Amino acid sequence: PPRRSSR
Amino acid sequence: PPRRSSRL
Amino acid sequence: ESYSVYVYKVLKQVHPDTGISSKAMGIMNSFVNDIFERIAGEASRLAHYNKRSTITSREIQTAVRLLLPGELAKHAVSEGTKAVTKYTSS
Amino acid sequence: KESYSVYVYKVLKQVHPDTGISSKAMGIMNSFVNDIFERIAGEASRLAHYNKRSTITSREIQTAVRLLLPGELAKHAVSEGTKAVTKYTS
Amino acid sequence: RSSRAGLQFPVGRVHRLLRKGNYAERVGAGAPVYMAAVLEYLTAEILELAGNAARDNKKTRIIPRHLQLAIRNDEELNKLLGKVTIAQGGVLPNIQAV
Amino acid sequence: KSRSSRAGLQFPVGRVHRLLRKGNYAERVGAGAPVYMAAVLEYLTAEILELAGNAARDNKKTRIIPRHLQLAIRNDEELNKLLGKVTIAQGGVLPNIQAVLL
Amino acid sequence: YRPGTVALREIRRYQKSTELLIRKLPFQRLVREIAQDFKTDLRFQSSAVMALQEASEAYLVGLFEDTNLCAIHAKRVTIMPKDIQLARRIRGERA
Amino acid sequence: YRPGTVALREIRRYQKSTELLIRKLPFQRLVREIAQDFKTDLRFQSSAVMALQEASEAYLVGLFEDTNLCAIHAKRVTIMPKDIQLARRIRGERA
Amino acid sequence: DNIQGITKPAIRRLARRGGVKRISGLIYEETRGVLKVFLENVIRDAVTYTEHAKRKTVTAMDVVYALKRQGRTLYGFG
Amino acid sequence: RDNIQGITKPAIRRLARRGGVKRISGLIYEETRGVLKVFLENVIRDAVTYTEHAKRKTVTAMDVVYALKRQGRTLYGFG
DNA sequence: TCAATTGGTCGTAGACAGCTCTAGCACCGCTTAAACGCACGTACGCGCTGTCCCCCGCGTTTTAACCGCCAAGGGGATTACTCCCTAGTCTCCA
DNA sequence: TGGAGACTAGGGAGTAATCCCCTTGGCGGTTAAAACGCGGGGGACAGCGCGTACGTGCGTTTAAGCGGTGCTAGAGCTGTCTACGACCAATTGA
Numbered sequence: 001p002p003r004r005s006s007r
Numbered sequence: 008p009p010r011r012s013s014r015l
Numbered sequence: 016e017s018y019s020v021y022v023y024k025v026l027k028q029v030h031p032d033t034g035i036s037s038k039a040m041g042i043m044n045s046f047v048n049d050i051f052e053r054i055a056g057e058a059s060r061l062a063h064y065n066k067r068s069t070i071t072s073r074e075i076q077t078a079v080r081l082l083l084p085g086e087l088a089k090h091a092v093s094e095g096t097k098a099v100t101k102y103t104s105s
Numbered sequence: 106k107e108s109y110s111v112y113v114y115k116v117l118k119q120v121h122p123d124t125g126i127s128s129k130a131m132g133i134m135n136s137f138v139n140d141i142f143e144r145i146a147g148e149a150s151r152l153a154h155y156n157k158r159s160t161i162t163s164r165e166i167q168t169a170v171r172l173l174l175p176g177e178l179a180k181h182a183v184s185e186g187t188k189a190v191t192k193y194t195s
Numbered sequence: 196r197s198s199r200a201g202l203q204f205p206v207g208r209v210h211r212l213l214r215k216g217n218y219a220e221r222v223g224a225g226a227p228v229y230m231a232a233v234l235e236y237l238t239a240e241i242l243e244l245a246g247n248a249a250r251d252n253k254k255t256r257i258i259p260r261h262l263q264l265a266i267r268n269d270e271e272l273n274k275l276l277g278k279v280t281i282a283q284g285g286v287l288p289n290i291q292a293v
Numbered sequence: 294k295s296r297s298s299r300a301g302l303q304f305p306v307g308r309v310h311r312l313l314r315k316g317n318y319a320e321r322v323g324a325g326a327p328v329y330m331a332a333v334l335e336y337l338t339a340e341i342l343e344l345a346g347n348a349a350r351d352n353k354k355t356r357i358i359p360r361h362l363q364l365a366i367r368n369d370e371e372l373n374k375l376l377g378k379v380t381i382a383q384g385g386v387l388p389n390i391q392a393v394l395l
Numbered sequence: 396y397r398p399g400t401v402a403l404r405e406i407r408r409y410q411k412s413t414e415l416l417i418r419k420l421p422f423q424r425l426v427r428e429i430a431q432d433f434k435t436d437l438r439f440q441s442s443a444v445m446a447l448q449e450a451s452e453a454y455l456v457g458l459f460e461d462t463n464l465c466a467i468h469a470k471r472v473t474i475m476p477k478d479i480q481l482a483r484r485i486r487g488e489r490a
Numbered sequence: 491y492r493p494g495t496v497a498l499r500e501i502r503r504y505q506k507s508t509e510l511l512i513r514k515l516p517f518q519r520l521v522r523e524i525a526q527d528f529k530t531d532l533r534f535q536s537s538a539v540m541a542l543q544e545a546s547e548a549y550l551v552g553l554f555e556d557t558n559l560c561a562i563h564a565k566r567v568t569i570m571p572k573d574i575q576l577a578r579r580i581r582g583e584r585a
Numbered sequence: 586d587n588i589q590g591i592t593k594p595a596i597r598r599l600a601r602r603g604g605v606k607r608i609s610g611l612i613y614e615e616t617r618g619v620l621k622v623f624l625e626n627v628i629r630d631a632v633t634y635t636e637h638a639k640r641k642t643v644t645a646m647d648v649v650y651a652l653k654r655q656g657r658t659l660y661g662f663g
Numbered sequence: 664r665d666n667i668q669g670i671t672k673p674a675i676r677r678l679a680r681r682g683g684v685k686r687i688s689g690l691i692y693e694e695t696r697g698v699l700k701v702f703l704e705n706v707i708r709d710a711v712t713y714t715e716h717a718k719r720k721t722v723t724a725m726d727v728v729y730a731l732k733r734q735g736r737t738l739y740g741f742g
Numbered sequence: 743t744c745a746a747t748t749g750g751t752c753g754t755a756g757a758c759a760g761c762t763c764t765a766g767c768a769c770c771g772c773t774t775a776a777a778c779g780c781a782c783g784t785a786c787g788c789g790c791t792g793t794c795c796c797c798c799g800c801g802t803t804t805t806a807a808c809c810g811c812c813a814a815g816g817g818g819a820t821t822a823c824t825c826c827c828t829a830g831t832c833t834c835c836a
Numbered sequence: 837t838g839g840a841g842a843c844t845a846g847g848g849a850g851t852a853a854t855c856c857c858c859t860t861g862g863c864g865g866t867t868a869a870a871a872c873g874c875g876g877g878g879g880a881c882a883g884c885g886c887g888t889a890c891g892t893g894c895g896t897t898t899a900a901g902c903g904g905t906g907c908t909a910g911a912g913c914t915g916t917c918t919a920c921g922a923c924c925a926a927t928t929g930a
Binding site: 150 | 382384
């Protein structure tokens with residue numbers, strides 16, 4: 001579960 | 008004497 | 016001045032297998048130390064303007080909304096308000 | 106910072122004895138003095154911070170003046186500041 | 196303090212920096228938490244685009260070139276870092292059509 | 294006597310001292326910093342007022358208005374560099390037409 | 396008068412005055428329209444709208460000064476939207 | 491080769507690189523010659539000169555971008571000193 | 586809706602103050618868009634400063650500060 | 664003396680090519696040399712002001728970084 | 743081994759309730775100054791054609807940048823005396 | 837009712853000494869880059885023609901601006917009082 005951005 | 012600048 | 020450990024650690028949770036050059040982290044240290052001084056100078060102003068003597072999360076919120084563009088502010092404010100909720104949660 | 110209207114009036118009195126000044130021109134002169142004050146004082150604060158110093162003194166103000174004021178304006182402003190401190194110390 | 200917020204950036208160091216930087220006579224309690232959450236989010240946002248640029252170049256490390264390539268190709272980060280020079284970063288490949 | 298008349302100034306060095314000590318610039322403020330700041334502020338004020346009163350007298354007026362301040366600043370290269378990002382309200386522009394258009 | 400000495404007379408007239416060249420009521424209405432997109436039931440000081448107009452007109456006059464330079468650079472006396480775009484791109488307003 | 495193809499290849503070559511395009515020793519001597527007018531016997535950290543070179547090269551590349559825009563504005567391909575002057579004046583560097 | 590209240594005569598007056606001799610017909614809509622963007626940028630910051638102080642009216646200082654932070658300091662409004 | 668000629672024409676057109684320029688006039692090289700001299704004189708003056716305020720004699724990369732900040736150009740990567 | 747946290751006073755900074763009166767808004771009427779629409783002509787933008795000069799590409803020659811590798815000394819960080827320095831406080835009528 | 841004068845005390849900065857590092861200076865070799873000449877060609881600039889879009893003037897319309905009237909939101913200032921951050925002491929681990 002890599003930390004990604006919702007932008 | 009008015010306060011007159013010496014600047015260019 | 017040196018945020019190298021935390022820039023490394025955030026890197027591992029977004030790109031676990033990717034590294035950073037010495038010059039590339041000497042750059043992110045400059046970025047962090049620049050944006051910190053941007054927010055802490057706008058929030059310092061926002062406290063003086065209201066004749067206020069303490070800087071709060073409200074002023075950090077307002078400084079972030081003034082400095083960061085568009086959807087960066089919307090997504091940085093939503094993360095600042097979530098880390099304080101968790102910081103002060105029993 | 107409440108106003109420099111009295112003092113701008115005295116300076117105008119001693120510079121142009123007959124010429125008066127408008128009420129809107131005085132607001133602009135007060136804005137000018139408040140802006141230049143902020144510019145010199147903020148640079149002096151940054152100067153003290155870079156040197157790890159907790160006091161702002163005549164050297165910080167003069168170096169901020171030299172950094173901010175352009176050309177011969179800086180030379181003459183430095184001379185007037187120096188003369189004022191020299192006469193005040195005496 | 197960093198663990199409670201669920202952050203990785205140092206809330207205590209941000210606190211000490213805010214107090215030493217004479218930004219105000221007093222510094223609150225959620226101010227360092229908010230500031231660290233803001234700096235860490237921005238750091239993670241740059242470090243994702245630069246690192247996507249590293250795979251787009253078939254690299255396993257991030258260099259100033261990748262950071263510049265990520266910042267200038269993002270409108271928000273480009274506007275934020277618009278007057279910023281990145282050392283050894285180059286420029287965005289761009290030729291006008293005359 | 295007064296701290297401004299001690300230095301031979303007209304700007305209030307006591308007021309500049311209070312503003313320096315209240316603005317969160319440093320933990321401490323030296324003794325000559327308010328005097329130096331007051332002297333530099335007075336010198337710049339005197340420069341702008343002298344040039345503004347000269348410009349107003351070139352318009353056959355006996356009162357400085359913001360137009361005269363703008364004329365004085367924009368016609369001086371050093372003051373133009375100083376106030377180069379400053380908008381003067383009710384100041385107008387320098388009268389300048391390009392030589393091509395004429 | 397031919398086509399273009401009245402333009403020079405107008406340049407001389409408006410470069411000599413310091414008035415506000417935009418009518419106050421429509422500009423105030425525009426300021427209120429734009430502000431309503433951010434906050435609802437927003438009130439304004441008269442000095443606030445006057446400061447906005449004083450800043451906007453100076454910004455537009457300064458931008459026209461650069462648009463004119465871009466027009467002279469292209470061997471033209473008519474300013475065109477491409478001149479505005481070049482001036483704005485060079486001063487970094489919007490690439 | 492036809493005049494221009496090698497130019498485009500050179501543009502592509504130097505636009506994907508990140509190295510400094512000025513030789514370091516001549517730039518160092520220029521920097522010391524300039525600094526000699528402000529203070530004598532001035533030492534320089536190697537990182538100081540490197541920072542000066544990085545800033546100067548980024549500044550010149552960014553200025554050449556604007557100069558190229560001014561060249562294209564005048565329906566030309568060759569950049570002339572006219573274009574540099576226009577870019578610098580609109581940027582506020584000049585009058 | 587009130588962007589057409591910045592009339593063509595007004596834009597032409599602003600251009601003549603800038604020294605412009607001839608004005609093309611497509612200039613007026615471009616100027617309206619540019620003014621709209623400028624006013625939006627300033628007013629957003631001014632309203633941010635207004636809501637921060639928990640006020641409901643936008644103060645002249647709120648505009649002056651929203652201009653200071655875009656590098657357009659304005660003298661005369663305190 | 665005459666160290667501005669060390670910024671040679673090939674280096675100037677290398678910077679121009681990085682700036683996306685196809686053709687260059689022969690008078691561009693002197694104009695670029697003058698522009699670079701102006702920029703460097705403006706930066707190395709604030710840098711030396713920062714150096715003399717510290718009562719130092721070596722110009723530090725931090726002095727250059729601050730002198731660039733003073734002119735609105737932030738530099739990343741030098742501390 | 744010092745920094746990052748924790749626990750407990752204390753005093754003041756700031757939140758909240760309550761007036762106060764300023765000024766911001768909403769509206770109307772009159773005047774008229776300014777905007778708008780149209781008709782017209784001409785000047786200017788733009789599209790060609792042609793000249794020729796200056797820039798580019800390339801093949802030699804030269805030059806000095808760059809890279810190691812020594813040698814010396816200035817001068818930038820430190821660390822402990824030393825005192826002069828400003829913040830703080832009280833009086834106080836300009 | 838603010839800043840000026842006169843003490844008191846802690847401590848921030850000035851000073852002398854040390855120490856080592858890093859900046860400068862020299863030298864030699866190699867070769868990569870700069871410089872120089874030459875030969876075209878393509879792009880800059882000038883001249884000309886055309887046509888259309890912009891300035892100009894005139895007549896009509898329409899809201900801007902000014903001068904009043906009135907109402908009330910809310911900015912601004914007290915007054916209270918509590919809760920939150922500064923400060924200090926423990927404390928314990930990365």
